[PDB]
């Protein structure tokens, strides 16, 4: 019950001392949105939800629900939904007379629902069979949280929510409101509870604690008269640390109780126990049944070890089987598991809250070092985000996030970056280029070695002998007038389809063979040539010629009613070059039209909105569903569906992009190759599950592309600009890119020091009584040092990390029993050098409140780390900032200001000690905002004349704060530990003595996450004003911004009209979800607008869109699309 460690647990989310014990021991307009969805796993189940012959895995994040189908290769995604609440219970069950299972869900605000998966055609819905709210007016929530269980015969549902009460929900075909009733329990402290198998009336078994140890007991539930009757067997005694109850299935029956160094089996009178030595070291957390009999079980530790529990049975000579013994075997090591589930055929899913989750295989024969476990996949988890910083290493106008993530063995550093990343190698400034093609200089040799530029009105054939550039045109091509395509198809030929003529050329003789010229002297507008044929179009008409060895043949010819804008050709499957289908785009009546290749026979047509002519179009194959993408001269990017057999009109919904028109042409990165679209921002359209990526590129701009696969440029692609050529190799595709650096120990704080080009990271590790546990970064440092002051264990270190290769340059080890709490890096006074300043405290087991600490000043030099000054202090050092040239530090309910003299010392200036436990500290100009432990906020000022502190204002209304930020000169933002956000403001009232010593809470919001850190910055290059990022315990990243008044009114009206139309999954009301909620109060939200709902307006259908804001549809599409580009 020492404060630093309990606060660290709160920072990671582990069960901490309840706040009540801590008590005993003693006019604004904002906009909030999400940039990265939560990633930690709270729960997970398996079953038959989608159909009767499917095996499903269902995963719960904080407010997300994900559904996967289990195949022989791994997992496949089918749906993902978001709920208006925090999921606390999730169970599958199947009533009699049902084809498949239904899902029960309970929310942390006590919303209950039953859901069913209904997939009819190609569309998928989640329908709500019943819904209600099960909250009690009077009572207090218990420890160990909420518990929910289901009878094996689907007769009732049992809930433990409060103390001294057991809530029962009957499960008959009536009860669409989930009416419940309470049964009184004599036992006021229940540890775990479950329903027993193979009984006649619903039987319940549970473990409780009271003076004289903890016990296990049973009951029978009579839902016909609302009372417990009596259990099948009496009450026993169990180990003082019994915590887990398992109900064994039918052939055995009975219960298995798990504690520490004991595993026990009770069934009526039968009783067995084992105490295998391996269980001593660490605690078992989770369990899962492998065999439907109940013949094997999996168990997982707090340190990552995975065990199998075996029940060996005895066949009776005439009676039912019994069991004789129990056995435990160490299987191996994984990540610490919050959820463990078993899938099928020796495959296990390990779901984690403090590390990456992963998919594992169990072998029958131990490999080297005797392990049965072999990893298969990992899924990234940003973990608890305990601290982060914004850094712009490469000196463009775009920053990156660097965060400390994870815990004990899973601790790491994460780098988060925006966009698609190319790595320019041959950078030369060439002005405007009209296009770009390859050319083959040899027979069909391996990767190409020649390229063709094309300028505003010209095409020039280069040569490429490696990294160098050279110009040497073979004397058979064009050099002064633009060609539409010059590439290759097959069979020892070259294409030259010019606006002057069409051609076939010899490559081995490098000579001309034959030519064909337009017999109208009228110049072509747009052509197309894919990989075996060319299709062209002139005036109002369209030719089509197949390219055959050594000559040309006319294969099709037909005029179009309107003037051709563009064409395309591509074989999309079992067709080796010849594409039976073809599409046409038009200027005047903007319309995509389907026309067969062989004879230009009419197939169909479809029109659109707008007037400006399109700039590009392609037919695209990425999945089993083909697409036709057109790109217009305004910024709209339209997509239509292709069924290559018939071609019935598939999905559509309008969109805008950047100001310049878009050019779309296909790239290569994987055998599931996708398309790239050139605009003001190059934009990949890639396949993720079935939808479209719209990710930008870390690039100024590009117009027209051509892939490059040469030996020195293995998977590159040359892109042209108004004045640039841009080439590089492709990283990931999605919007955010995450890079991981493993540390093998817990990080706590991070800070950046530019003039050194390094990071400083505080870290900690655990050591047995002290030798070793495993190699870590604090151990394998390049250099190392130990403190030499003269004024399990945890060992704290300061790590100096290189910013390029991300390796540990140096490690400093602090004194014994010393906890480093805060870190800063700055310049003080008139000294020119920049230091690393660290604040610590000395932590002892018996006593309850630290009473000493240091403030150490380090200088990192050419290759070493020195020490400059020490300044022992009488208390813990919770935070410090660099104020103006001085140092501001909070010492154990006091705030103090220090000065850096010419002797390289620090000297005290002034103090303020009215608060209690000042934890957080932020500064702006001459004001200081102090965030208290349980005393809301406090605003202070520094008076340069008298050189001391003056208390300007204080906020009443107790609040258990967890983070603090300064928005501008007058609005202060705070996050509290019940998952709420609030905004305070300085009251402008008369009577200048008393009511100006008040801050008014002018904004309230319920977020649903636990905020750990705020920081000023943004992730995009270069309506709204300001930008603050925050990070949470579940791994979510969010963004807060300020608005005007007219915009706030507009969007609030929009919010009401939107949630009058959208259907919520469990039929929860958005207004109820976002209300400010603590045990002491509940008020409607005000002063906040949430952008998740607003951004969902772009996913709605055209008729539903006009119902909202019934003042045009596009007039609001523009606004929302503008808002979408903030993050």
Curated annotation (Swiss-Prot):
Keyword set, alphabetical order = Acetylation, Biological rhythms, Cytoplasm, Disease variant, DNA damage, DNA repair, DNA-binding, Host-virus interaction, Intellectual disability, Isopeptide bond, Nucleus, Phosphoprotein, Repeat, Ubl conjugation, Ubl conjugation pathway
Name the predominant localization: cytoplasm
Question: Where are the stretches annotated WD repeat beta-propeller A?
Answer: 39-382
Region WD repeat beta-propeller C, as annotated, extends over 735-1043
Keyword Nucleus set for record: yes
Region entry Interaction with CDT1 and CUL4A, spans: 792-1127
The molecular function terms of the Gene Ontology recorded here are: cullin family protein binding; damaged DNA binding; DNA binding; protein-containing complex binding; protein-macromolecule adaptor activity; ubiquitin ligase complex scaffold activity; WD40-repeat domain binding
Can you summarize the PTM annotation of this record?
Phosphorylated by ABL1.
UniProt KW Ubl conjugation keyword: yes
Q: Which Pfam families match?
A: Beta-prop_RSE1_1st, Beta-prop_RSE1_2nd, CPSF_A
Q: Where is this region: Interaction with CDT1?
A: 28-789
N-acetylserine modified-residue sites: 28
Q: Which residues carry this modification: Phosphothreonine?
A: 1112
Q: Where in the cell is it found?
A: Cytoplasm; Nucleus
Question: What role is this protein assigned?
Answer: Protein, which is both involved in DNA repair and protein ubiquitination, as part of the UV-DDB complex and DCX (DDB1-CUL4-X-box) complexes, respectively. Core component of the UV-DDB complex (UV-damaged DNA-binding protein complex), a complex that recognizes UV-induced DNA damage and recruit proteins of the nucleotide excision repair pathway (the NER pathway) to initiate DNA repair. The UV-DDB complex preferentially binds to cyclobutane pyrimidine dimers (CPD), 6-4 photoproducts (6-4 PP), apurinic sites and short mismatches.
Q: What is known of its domains?
A: The core of the protein consists of three WD40 beta-propeller domains.
PANTHER family annotated for this entry?
Answer: DNA REPAIR/RNA PROCESSING CPSF FAMILY
The text of the family note is:
Belongs to the DDB1 family.
Assembly information from the UniProt record: Component of the UV-DDB complex which includes DDB1 and DDB2; the heterodimer dimerizes to give rise to a heterotetramer when bound to damaged DNA. The UV-DDB complex interacts with monoubiquitinated histone H2A and binds to XPC via the DDB2 subunit. Component of numerous DCX (DDB1-CUL4-X-box) E3 ubiquitin-protein ligase complexes which consist of a core of DDB1, CUL4A or CUL4B and RBX1. DDB1 may recruit specific substrate targeting subunits to the DCX complex.
Protein name as catalogued: DNA damage-binding protein 1
Q: Tell me what organism the protein belongs to.
A: Homo sapiens
Ranked from the top, the taxonomy reads: Eukaryota, Metazoa, Chordata, Craniata, Vertebrata
């Amino acid at each position: 019950q020492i404060l630093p460690k309990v606060l660290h647990k709160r920072t990671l989310g582990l069960p901490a001392m309840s706040t009540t014990d801590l008590e005993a021991y003693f006019m604004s307009y904002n906009y909030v949105v999400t940039a990265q969805k939560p990633t930690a796993v709270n729960g997970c189940v398996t079953g038959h939800f989608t159909s009767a012959e499917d095996l499903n895995l269902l995963i719960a994040k904080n407010t997300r629900l994900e559904i996967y189908v289990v195949t022989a290769e791994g997992l496949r995604p089918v749906k993902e939904v978001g709920m208006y609440g925090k999921i606390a219970v999730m169970e599958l069950f199947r009533p009699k007379g049902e084809s498949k299972d239904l899902l029960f869900i309970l929310t942390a605000k006590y919303n209950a629902c039953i859901l069913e998966y209904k997939q009819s055609g190609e569309s998928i819905d989640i329908i709500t069979r019943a819904h209600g709210n099960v909250q009690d007016r009077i009572g207090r929530p218990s420890e160990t949280g909420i518990i929910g269980i289901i009878d094996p015969e689907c007769r009732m549902i049992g809930l433990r929510l409060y103390d001294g009460l057991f809530k029962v929900i009957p499960l008959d075909r009536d009860n669409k409101e989930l009416k419940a009733f309470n049964i009184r329990l004599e036992e006021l402290h229940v540890i775990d509870v479950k329903f027993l198998y193979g009984c006649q009336a619903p039987t319940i078994c549970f473990v409780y604690q009271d003076p004289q140890g903890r016990h296990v007991k049973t009951y029978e539930v009579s839902l016909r008269e609302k009372e417990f009757n009596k259990g099948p067997w009496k009450q026993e005694n169990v180990e003082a640390e019994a915590s887990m109850v398992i109900a064994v299935p039918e052939p055995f029956g009975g219960a298995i109780i798990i504690g520490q160094e004991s595993i026990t089996y009770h069934n009526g009178d039968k009783y067995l126990a084992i105490a295998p030595p391996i269980i001593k070291q660490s605690t078992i957390v989770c369990h899962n049944r492998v065999d439907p009999n109940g013949s094997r079980y999996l168990l997982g530790d707090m340190e990552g070890r995975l065990f199998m529990l075996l029940l060996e049975k005895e066949e009776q000579m005439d009676g039912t089987v019994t069991l004789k013994d129990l056995r435990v075997e160490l299987l191996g090591e994984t990540s610490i598991a919050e959820c463990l589930t078993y899938l099928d055929n020796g495959v296990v899913f390990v779901g984690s809250r403090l590390g990456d989750s992963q998919l594992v295989k169990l072998n029958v024969d131990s490999n080297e070092q005797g392990s049965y476990v072999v990893a298969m996949e990992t899924f990234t988890n940003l973990g608890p985000i305990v601290d982060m910083c914004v850094v712009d290493l490469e000196r463009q106008g775009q920053g990156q996030l660097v965060t400390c993530s994870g815990a004990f063995k899973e601790g790491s550093l994460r780098i988060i970056r925006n966009g698609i990343g190319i790595h320019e190698h041959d950078s030369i400034d060439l002005p405007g280029i009209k296009g770009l093609w390859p050319l083959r200089s040899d027979p069909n040799r391996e990767t190409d070695d020649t390229l063709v530029l094309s300028f505003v009105g010209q095409t020039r054939v280069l040569m490429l002998n490696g990294e160098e550039v050279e110009e040497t045109e073979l004397m058979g091509f064009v050099d002064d007038q633009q060609t539409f395509f010059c590439g290759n198809v097959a069979h020892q030929q070259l294409i030259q389809i010019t606006s002057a003529s069409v051609r076939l050329v010899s490559q081995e003789p490098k000579a001309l063979v034959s030519e064909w010229k337009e017999p109208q002297a009228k110049n072509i507008s747009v052509a197309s040539c894919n990989s075996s044929q060319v299709v062209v179009a002139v005036g109002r008409a369209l030719y089509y010629l197949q390219i055959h060895p050594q000559e040309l043949r006319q294969i099709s010819h037909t005029e179009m009613e309107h003037e051709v804008a563009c064409l395309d050709i591509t074989p999309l499957g079992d067709s080796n070059g010849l594409s039976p289908l073809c599409a046409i785009g038009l200027k005047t009546d903007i319309s995509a039209r389907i026309l067969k290749l062989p004879s230009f026979e009419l197939l169909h047509k479809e029109m659109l909105g707008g007037e400006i002519d399109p700039e590009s179009i392609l037919m695209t194959t990425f999945e089993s569903s083909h697409y036709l993408l057109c790109a217009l001269g305004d910024g709209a990017l339209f997509y239509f569906g292709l069924n290559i057999e018939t071609g019935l009109l598939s999905d559509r919904k309008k969109v805008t992009l950047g100001t310049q028109p878009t050019v779309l042409r296909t790239f290569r990165s994987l055998s599931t190759t996708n398309v790239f679209a050139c605009s003001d921002r190059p934009t990949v359209i890639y396949s993720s599950n079935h939808k479209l990526v719209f990710s930008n590129v870390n690039l100024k701009e590009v117009n027209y592309m051509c892939p490059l696969n040469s030996d020195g440029y293995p998977d590159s692609l040359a892109l042209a600009n108004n004045s640039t050529l841009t080439i590089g190799t492709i990283d990931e595709i999605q919007k955010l890119h995450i890079r991981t650096v493993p540390l093998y120990e817990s990080p706590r704080k991070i800070c950046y020091q530019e003039v050194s080009q390094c990071f400083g990271v505080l870290s900690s590790r655990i050591e047995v009584q002290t030798t070793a546990l495993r190699p870590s970064a604090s151990t394998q440092a390049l250099s190392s040092s130990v403190s030499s002051s003269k004024l399990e264990v945890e060992v704290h270190n300061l790590l100096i990390i290189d910013q390029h290769t991300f390796e540990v340059l140096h490690a400093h080890q602090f004194l014994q029993n010393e906890y480093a709490l805060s870190l800063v890096s700055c310049k003080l006074g008139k000294d020119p050098n920049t230091y690393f300043i660290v604040g610590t405290a000395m932590v002892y087991p018996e006593e309850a409140e630290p009473k000493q600490g240091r403030i150490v000043v380090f200088q990192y030099s050419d290759g070493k780390l020195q020490t400059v000054a020490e300044k022992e202090v009488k208390g813990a050092v919770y935070s410090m900032v660099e104020f103006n040239g001085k140092l501001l530090a909070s010492i154990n309910s006091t705030v103090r200001l220090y000065e850096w003299t010419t002797e390289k010392e620090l000297r005290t200036e002034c103090n303020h000690y009215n608060n209690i436990m000042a934890l957080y500290l932020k500064t702006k100009g001459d004001f200081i905002l102090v965030g208290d432990l349980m005393r809301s906020v406090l605003l202070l000022a520094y008076k340069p004349m008298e050189g001391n502190f003056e208390e300007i204002a204080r906020d009443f209304n107790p609040n258990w704060m967890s983070a603090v930020e300064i928005l501008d000169d007058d609005n202060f933002l705070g996050a509290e530990n019940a998952f709420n956000l609030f905004v305070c403001q300085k009251d402008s009232a008369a009577t200048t003595d008393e009511e100006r010593q008040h801050l008014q809470e002018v904004g309230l919001f319920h977020l649903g996450e636990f905020v750990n850190v705020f920081c000023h910055g943004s992730l995009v290059m270069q309506p709204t004003q300001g930008s603050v990022l925050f990070g949470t315990v579940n791994g979510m990243i969010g963004l807060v911004t300020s608005l005007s008044e007219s915009w706030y009114n507009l969007l609030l009206d929009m919010q009401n009209r939107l949630n009058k139309v959208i259907k919520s999954v469990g039929k929860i009301e958005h207004s109820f979800w976002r209300s400010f909620h603590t045990e002491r109060k509940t008020e409607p939200a005000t002063g906040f607008i949430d952008g998740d709902l607003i951004e969902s307006f772009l996913d709605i259908s055209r008729p539903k869109m006009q119902e909202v804001v019934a003042a045009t549809a596009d007039d609001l599409i523009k606004v929302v699309e503008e808002l979408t580009r903030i993050h």
